[PDB]
Amino acid sequence: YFSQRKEYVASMVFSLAMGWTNMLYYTRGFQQMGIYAVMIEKMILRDLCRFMFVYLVFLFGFSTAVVTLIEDGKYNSLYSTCLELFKFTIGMGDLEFTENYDFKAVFIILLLAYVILTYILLLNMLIALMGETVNKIAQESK
């Protein structure tokens, strides 16, 4: 701010966001409510940290395969393709095969394989593990 850069807005906003979620710290010590803060702690530190490597392997592998196969289109940059395949993981892609392009059959096979592997299989694996972690610490709530 004092260095004459408008980029301070960016830093400010992150603190503002964090400032609200840190109010979960004050749920600790209520017998009913503290379990939610604990569950979030355990899930972020254990489950997402371990799952991240697996998912990034799958994401980068299929993403770079798609970018290599495609030439001259929207899917010709790592940025857009990573965004799109990540959208497919969390079930908000669209698989609209409405482009004129080469090796269309192989492109379709790859996207279907990725969708099955990440949406159906991996994501429910993670959700199963998170459910295990959540149920494991209900009885320790006291």
Next chain:
Amino acid sequence: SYTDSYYKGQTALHIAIERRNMTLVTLLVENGADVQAAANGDFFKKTKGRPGFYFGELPLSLAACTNQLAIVKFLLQNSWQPADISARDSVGNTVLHALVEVADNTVDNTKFVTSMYNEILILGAKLHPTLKLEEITNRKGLTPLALAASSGKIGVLAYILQREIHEPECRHLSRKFTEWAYGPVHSSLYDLSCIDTCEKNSVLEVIAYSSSETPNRHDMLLVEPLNRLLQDKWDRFVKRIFYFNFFVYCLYMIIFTAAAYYRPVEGLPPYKLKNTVGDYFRVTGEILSVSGGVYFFFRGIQYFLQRRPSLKSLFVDSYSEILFFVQSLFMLVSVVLYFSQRKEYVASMVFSLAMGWTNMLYYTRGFQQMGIYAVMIEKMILRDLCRFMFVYLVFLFGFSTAVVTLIEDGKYNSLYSTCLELFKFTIGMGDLEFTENYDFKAVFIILLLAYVILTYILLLNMLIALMGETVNKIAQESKNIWKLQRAITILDTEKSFLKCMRKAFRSGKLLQVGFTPDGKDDYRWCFRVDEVNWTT
């Protein structure tokens, strides 16, 4: 004798009985110690939020509560200063009330307390045959049976309702009367007094309208005479009345829906009737709808005034009455806005209409199969969503105001639109279409993806795991929940009944024993049960 505010009234006889010294008790009673002193200090009162020993404040109560029968017989029979068996404390609890209070639904405690209760009743019959201890109520108007039912003492309740004494000169204290037995089957009579018709506070009223903290609220209905009573009342007359009420409610909602759908669209209510068929039927439907709203309104007020529920348990019990009452309130507010010449009555009417259908789920209670869904919806809403709202709103507001602050000039530049879109993202129907030209786009993307990962993936599945655990918690308890709801329905149907008859009795006013302590005979509304048991 202790004179402070903590041990007020404690004296030597209490110490001797407490120490289990027969010799010192005999000497103290010999020397003229008061056998009816009241030790009512704060250490000795009935209380939960302070360590203490409540026994009923009297030496006889102390002796009974401590499993010392010899001292009880001494105090009652000894001629230096005999003890009154029917004495009461400051709470009004007699020895039997004190015995009920010290139960804890364990095997050995059940054996002790049941034994001491039985012996005291026999001795009371012998000493004062015209005395009826079991009809003495404490300060709150509870008999020992009602106190046991309210407190959830399953052992004492099971003992009392199934009490039998095979001995003359005390047989009139029995309640279960075995008339015959065959190989696997035996037929008996059950006394039934103050189960159905006591006029003050019956057992079924106490069990049904308990405050949901009672440790065995639903197991108490499995005790045999109660279970047979509820089944008989259900099959005899209540079942038909319940189905009739459900059918009438269905007709009411059909009329209400039809009237609501065909509202006039012209401005400025109220609207005047034209001499045409559709107007007559529409106005008829409106009048019936408002009538139904007024009916449910006054039923709600009657319920709340009769029960007087506390704020802490206002919703934990009485969920259904609250929802029916809120439906009534929306209907009345709609009527007020209608005759006040405002369009906004449509808004109020609509909410009542929606509520009117979902309250149909109240009638799936009392089915063994179907009532579990109504119960699950209630518990999920009352526990999981109400606790989870604070957490989720903290996240929503944090990222919402962050994004609004970052962005200048766009659709994401007001709290309303950004809160709605972030909510859409949380339930998995966003767009993520990062196609707008605006500054700080990288930070915007980082914020939004962090929000998606935090709320869509993580928190939402946390909620779902918790709700699923709740459902699996009560997959098992269906059988008991069904019975409890059926009991509440039966009592509620008994209370109104809209015929001026109170034929709530089961079997005849039969002579039970015929041989009282005096020359009279007792007719007691006994109820016949033929039980079967394949043991041996």
Next chain:
Amino acid sequence: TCEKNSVLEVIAYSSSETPNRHDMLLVEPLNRLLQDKWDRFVKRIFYFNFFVYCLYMIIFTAAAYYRPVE
């Protein structure tokens, strides 16, 4: 009150690998002490801290919302 190293400090600031870190607080004098200190004076201080943090965040939000756009 130890002045060097008390029991509650040792239990509370343990490294989470201690086998009975949760059960050690159920020992009766400790459980009563924590309940007593909570009800005596700490509970009001904690609620006051939470209230002040709420006010702080509201002030921060309002100040950030109305930043100048030049």
